[PDB]
Amino acid sequence: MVNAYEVLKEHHVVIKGLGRKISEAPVNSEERHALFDELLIELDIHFRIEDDLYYPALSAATKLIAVAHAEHRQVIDQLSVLLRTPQSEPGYEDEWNSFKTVLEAHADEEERDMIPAPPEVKITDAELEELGEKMAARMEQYRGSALYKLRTKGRAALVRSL
Ligand SMILES: [Fe+3]
Ligand SMILES: [Fe+3]
Protein backbone atom coordinates (compact mmCIF):
# COMPACT_ATOMS: atom_id res chain seq x y z
CA MET A 1 0.00 0.00 0.00
CA VAL A 2 1.66 3.20 -1.24
CA ASN A 3 0.41 6.75 -0.66
CA ALA A 4 1.10 10.14 -2.19
CA TYR A 5 3.42 11.22 0.65
CA GLU A 6 5.61 8.14 0.38
CA VAL A 7 5.91 8.54 -3.39
CA LEU A 8 7.26 12.09 -3.02
CA LYS A 9 9.43 11.40 0.01
CA GLU A 10 11.09 8.38 -1.61
CA HIS A 11 11.62 10.31 -4.81
CA HIS A 12 13.19 13.10 -2.77
CA VAL A 13 15.68 10.56 -1.39
CA VAL A 14 16.49 9.58 -4.99
CA ILE A 15 17.06 13.21 -6.01
CA LYS A 16 19.14 14.01 -2.92
CA GLY A 17 21.19 10.88 -3.54
CA LEU A 18 21.93 11.90 -7.11
CA GLY A 19 22.92 15.36 -5.85
CA ARG A 20 25.39 13.74 -3.42
CA LYS A 21 26.86 11.47 -6.11
CA ILE A 22 27.26 14.44 -8.47
CA SER A 23 29.00 16.43 -5.74
CA GLU A 24 31.38 13.57 -5.04
CA ALA A 25 32.32 12.91 -8.67
CA PRO A 26 35.32 14.79 -10.12
CA VAL A 27 34.41 18.03 -11.89
CA ASN A 28 33.94 17.45 -15.66
CA SER A 29 34.39 13.68 -15.34
CA GLU A 30 32.41 11.35 -17.58
CA GLU A 31 30.84 10.06 -14.37
CA ARG A 32 29.61 13.48 -13.22
CA HIS A 33 28.13 14.36 -16.62
CA ALA A 34 26.03 11.16 -16.73
CA LEU A 35 24.91 11.66 -13.13
CA PHE A 36 23.85 15.20 -13.94
CA ASP A 37 21.76 14.02 -16.91
CA GLU A 38 20.11 11.48 -14.62
CA LEU A 39 19.30 14.25 -12.17
CA LEU A 40 17.73 16.32 -14.95
CA ILE A 41 15.46 13.40 -15.86
CA GLU A 42 14.41 12.87 -12.23
CA LEU A 43 13.87 16.61 -11.62
CA ASP A 44 11.71 16.90 -14.73
CA ILE A 45 9.37 14.14 -13.69
CA HIS A 46 9.32 15.24 -10.02
CA PHE A 47 8.10 18.74 -10.71
CA ARG A 48 5.61 17.37 -13.24
CA ILE A 49 3.97 14.91 -10.90
CA GLU A 50 3.81 17.70 -8.28
CA ASP A 51 2.29 20.26 -10.69
CA ASP A 52 -0.04 17.84 -12.44
CA LEU A 53 -1.27 15.59 -9.62
CA TYR A 54 -0.08 16.46 -6.12
CA TYR A 55 -0.54 20.22 -5.89
CA PRO A 56 -4.00 20.13 -7.55
CA ALA A 57 -5.15 17.70 -4.86
CA LEU A 58 -3.79 20.19 -2.29
CA SER A 59 -5.35 23.22 -4.02
CA ALA A 60 -7.30 24.31 -0.93
CA ALA A 61 -4.03 25.61 0.63
CA THR A 62 -3.91 28.49 -1.80
CA LYS A 63 -1.05 30.45 -0.23
CA LEU A 64 1.20 27.39 0.19
CA ILE A 65 0.44 26.35 -3.40
CA ALA A 66 1.55 29.76 -4.68
CA VAL A 67 4.75 29.51 -2.64
CA ALA A 68 5.48 26.00 -3.94
CA HIS A 69 5.00 27.06 -7.57
CA ALA A 70 7.28 30.04 -6.90
CA GLU A 71 9.91 27.75 -5.39
CA HIS A 72 9.76 25.57 -8.52
CA ARG A 73 10.52 28.70 -10.49
CA GLN A 74 13.46 29.39 -8.18
CA VAL A 75 14.95 25.97 -8.94
CA ILE A 76 14.36 26.23 -12.70
CA ASP A 77 15.78 29.77 -12.91
CA GLN A 78 18.88 28.64 -11.00
CA LEU A 79 19.27 25.63 -13.30
CA SER A 80 19.44 28.05 -16.24
CA VAL A 81 22.30 29.89 -14.49
CA LEU A 82 24.10 26.61 -13.76
CA LEU A 83 23.85 25.55 -17.40
CA ARG A 84 25.66 28.68 -18.56
CA THR A 85 28.85 27.62 -16.71
CA PRO A 86 30.18 24.32 -18.17
CA GLN A 87 32.01 21.96 -15.81
CA SER A 88 35.31 22.90 -17.50
CA GLU A 89 34.97 26.54 -16.36
CA PRO A 90 36.66 27.73 -13.13
CA GLY A 91 33.49 28.98 -11.45
CA TYR A 92 31.50 25.79 -12.08
CA GLU A 93 31.64 24.29 -8.57
CA ASP A 94 30.27 27.50 -7.01
CA GLU A 95 27.39 27.42 -9.51
CA TRP A 96 26.65 23.77 -8.71
CA ASN A 97 26.63 24.48 -4.97
CA SER A 98 24.25 27.41 -5.52
CA PHE A 99 21.93 25.15 -7.51
CA LYS A 100 22.07 22.28 -5.00
CA THR A 101 21.33 24.75 -2.21
CA VAL A 102 18.18 26.15 -3.87
CA LEU A 103 16.93 22.68 -4.79
CA GLU A 104 17.38 21.10 -1.37
CA ALA A 105 15.87 24.14 0.38
CA HIS A 106 12.70 23.74 -1.70
CA ALA A 107 12.47 20.01 -1.00
CA ASP A 108 12.89 20.65 2.71
CA GLU A 109 10.34 23.49 2.69
CA GLU A 110 8.02 21.06 0.88
CA GLU A 111 8.41 18.42 3.59
CA ARG A 112 7.78 21.21 6.12
CA ASP A 113 4.65 22.78 4.69
CA MET A 114 3.16 20.37 2.11
CA ILE A 115 3.82 16.77 3.27
CA PRO A 116 1.39 15.81 4.75
CA ALA A 117 -1.24 18.07 3.25
CA PRO A 118 -1.96 21.30 5.16
CA PRO A 119 -5.03 21.33 7.43
CA GLU A 120 -7.19 23.13 4.81
CA VAL A 121 -6.96 20.03 2.60
CA LYS A 122 -9.58 17.35 3.23
CA ILE A 123 -8.07 14.16 1.85
CA THR A 124 -8.72 10.67 3.17
CA ASP A 125 -6.38 7.72 3.61
CA ALA A 126 -8.18 6.03 0.72
CA GLU A 127 -7.69 9.07 -1.54
CA LEU A 128 -4.02 9.29 -0.58
CA GLU A 129 -3.52 5.68 -1.64
CA GLU A 130 -5.23 6.22 -4.98
CA LEU A 131 -3.37 9.50 -5.55
CA GLY A 132 -0.11 7.74 -4.69
CA GLU A 133 -0.89 4.99 -7.21
CA LYS A 134 -1.71 7.58 -9.89
CA MET A 135 1.55 9.43 -9.15
CA ALA A 136 3.69 6.30 -9.25
CA ALA A 137 2.18 5.37 -12.63
CA ARG A 138 2.50 8.87 -14.03
CA MET A 139 6.13 9.15 -12.84
CA GLU A 140 6.88 6.08 -14.95
CA GLN A 141 5.11 7.56 -17.97
CA TYR A 142 6.96 10.87 -17.45
CA ARG A 143 10.32 9.14 -17.14
CA GLY A 144 9.74 7.37 -20.45
CA SER A 145 8.88 10.69 -22.10
CA ALA A 146 11.82 12.47 -20.47
CA LEU A 147 14.24 9.76 -21.65
CA TYR A 148 12.81 9.97 -25.15
CA LYS A 149 13.44 13.72 -25.17
CA LEU A 150 17.01 13.39 -23.85
CA ARG A 151 17.80 10.41 -26.09
CA THR A 152 16.30 11.76 -29.33
CA LYS A 153 16.36 15.57 -28.81
CA GLY A 154 19.26 16.16 -26.41
CA ARG A 155 19.85 17.81 -23.07
CA ALA A 156 18.78 21.27 -24.24
CA ALA A 157 15.30 20.12 -25.25
CA LEU A 158 14.87 18.37 -21.91
CA VAL A 159 15.77 21.56 -20.07
CA ARG A 160 13.42 23.72 -22.15
CA SER A 161 10.55 21.37 -21.23
CA LEU A 162 10.79 22.15 -17.47
FE1 LIG B 1 8.41 20.51 -5.22
FE1 LIG C 1 9.30 17.59 -4.27
Side-chain angles (χ1 to χ4, degrees), residues 1-15 17-121 123-133 135-162:
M1 314 280 167
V2 89
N3 70 43
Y5 306 148
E6 305 175 334
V7 174
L8 290 171
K9 290 172 124 190
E10 297 169 8
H11 202 226
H12 282 157
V13 178
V14 169
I15 288 164
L18 281 165
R20 178 177 62 257
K21 275 177 143 224
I22 292 168
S23 307
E24 282 163 353
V27 170
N28 204 29
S29 61
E30 295 163 354
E31 177 194 355
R32 195 162 172 143
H33 281 296
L35 286 165
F36 184 65
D37 280 351
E38 299 174 45
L39 176 60
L40 291 185
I41 288 167
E42 294 311 303
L43 274 182
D44 177 25
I45 76 198
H46 191 82
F47 285 174
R48 236 173 260 272
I49 69 145
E50 289 184 351
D51 293 341
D52 299 349
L53 285 172
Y54 189 66
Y55 293 161
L58 270 62
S59 64
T62 67
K63 198 172 83 167
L64 285 173
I65 289 291
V67 167
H69 282 134
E71 305 215 327
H72 284 191
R73 198 177 305 279
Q74 282 292 70
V75 176
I76 292 165
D77 280 9
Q78 193 68 43
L79 171 62
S80 300
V81 179
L82 176 58
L83 291 186
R84 296 194 300 265
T85 296
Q87 298 198 18
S88 61
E89 245 195 88
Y92 162 76
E93 200 159 25
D94 286 341
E95 294 307 331
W96 164 252
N97 280 330
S98 292
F99 176 67
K100 197 175 80 178
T101 287
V102 174
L103 174 61
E104 287 179 316
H106 158 65
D108 289 338
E109 137 112 284
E110 198 163 78
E111 275 162 19
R112 188 181 83 222
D113 287 1
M114 299 291 285
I115 302 172
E120 294 86 4
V121 181
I123 186 165
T124 69
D125 286 354
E127 283 140 60
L128 285 162
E129 279 178 5
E130 184 54 80
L131 178 60
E133 287 298 355
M135 285 164 65
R138 191 77 67 85
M139 187 173 275
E140 188 99 22
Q141 176 197 309
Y142 287 168
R143 188 178 288 112
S145 157
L147 284 161
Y148 176 87
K149 291 187 178 93
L150 176 66
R151 175 172 51 92
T152 70
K153 287 173 182 28
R155 196 186 74 165
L158 177 65
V159 176
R160 293 190 299 255
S161 79
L162 307 176

